[PDB]
Structures are given as C-alpha cells and as structure tokens.
Write a protein that binds this ligand. Structure first.
Ligand SMILES: [Ca+2]
Ligand SMILES: [Ca+2]
Length: 220
DNA sequence: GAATCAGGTGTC
C-alpha cells in the first residue's frame, strides 16, 4: 500500500528481496518484481500463479563461490543487481528490503518491507520459491543431503550430514560452521579435481589460516 | 499464524 505512493511520483517502481543469506550451501537468490494489476493477499487482509501471470519478474543469483570471494553482503546486491537486469521493464525507482543497500537503480530501503510493500512482498515469495525448487534438485543431485527439507540451512540434520558425509563445493566454505570442518587437505583435493577455482582455493586458505590466528591470539 | 527453540552474516 506504500507501493502505491511511490508509483505516483516515479511511475515504474520495482520490488526487490532475496532469499538464503543464512545458508551453508547454495547460491543467494534475488527477485525483482514490477506489478500493476493489483493482487489482494500480498501484504493485505495460491497467489504464486497470480504473480506469474500478472507481473514483471527478474531473477538473479550469486554462486556460492561468489559468497566466498565477495562475502555474503556483496554477493547479495550482486544477485539483486542481476535481478533488475534480468527484469524486462526498466523501473525509474526501487524499494529494497532491508537497510544499507545501494543498487544500480535509484531506490530506497524498507525495514520489514517484505511485510509492508506488495512489490517486495511479491519478490520475496518469488525468491524463496525459486530457491526452494533449486535446493530440491540439489537434493536429487546430492542425494546424501536433505536439501529438499532444511534448504541448505544450518539445521541439526544438515550439520550431521556434513559431518557424516563431507563438505560439498556448493557449501559456503567461508561460513563459520562449514569452515570449522574444513581441512586444507580437502581444499587441495577440491582444487585439484577442478571443483573450485584457484581464486576460491586461495581465499579459503587465507581464511582458515586467519581462523587459526585469532585462536592463537585468543589463547594468550 | 504466533511463539519459541535452534543455526547463519553483514555495516555502524
Ligand atoms: Ca524479513
Ligand atoms: Ca526474503
């Protein structure tokens, strides 16, 4: 309903939101949603279909590699910027979920906007839904992991699976709980088998060795 | 759905 005020001044406004910033595995997902024919139900009082039939949508992704090289915050806007880019209508303005985000289109940030703007409310759905059906095929591809349930998140299951099964190249290797399970041994193997770029290989080395450092200081 | 447990990272 706040979405309506912005449309009056800027005309074509979009909604951005992301999913999967707290995961241990997978990319981060973003979604950009221009929308006209209004939908009751999104931030009001089976709309997946209505949103698809009745809106403009761009989706962006950042590979887990990219979360590890760039970091979880930058990888996010990287996807978000790819969403606007993948969106078919150029908006004059954007309402982003969160705070402290500057995107390639002039915009404003809304705290709990995924819960007060319809355009963001839309993309936030789009985002999860895609991510979810993505984690699904990850589950099929990596049968050992219940990706289809925990969504790559840091649940008790997912951890046990990592511990019992080993880390994957689709794990965010710079993520504390994954990191703490990491041996350069594996890194090397991942590298040698061509399952990680040299860039990532280095980064993670530098990171492990830095993890030891703060423990070393902290032990003194 | 609202609470309440759990687990992630980022900027100021
Ligand atoms: Ca939220
Ligand atoms: Ca979201």
């Amino acid at each position: 309903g706040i979405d309506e005020l912005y449309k009056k001044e800027f005309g074509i406004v979009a909604g951005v939101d992301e999913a999967s910033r707290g995961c241990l595995a997978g990319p981060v997902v973003a979604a950009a949603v221009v929308l006209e024919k209004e939908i009751e139900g999104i931030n009001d009082s089976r709309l997946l279909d209505e949103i698809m039939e009745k809106a403009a949508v761009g989706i962006g992704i950042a590979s887990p590699e990219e979360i590890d090289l760039y970091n979880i915050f930058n990888a996010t806007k990287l996807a978000m910027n790819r969403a606007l880019e993948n969106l078919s209508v150029k908006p004059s303005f954007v309402l982003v979920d969160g705070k402290g985000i500057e995107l390639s289109v002039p915009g404003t940030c809304l705290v709990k906007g995924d819960q007060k703007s319809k355009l963001i409310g839309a993309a936030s759905i789009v985002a999860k839904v895609f991510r979810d059906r993505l984690m699904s095929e990850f589950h099929r591809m990596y049968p050992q992991f219940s990706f289809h349930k925990h969504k790559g998140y840091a649940t008790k299951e997912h951890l046990n699976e990592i511990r019992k099964n080993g880390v994957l190249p689709i794990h965010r290797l710079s993520f504390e709980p994954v990191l703490e399970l990491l041996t350069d041994d594996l890194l090397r193997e991942f590298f040698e088998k061509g399952l990680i770029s040299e860039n990532r290989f280095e980064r993670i080395l530098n990171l492990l060795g830095a993890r030891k450092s703060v423990v070393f200081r902290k032990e003194r």
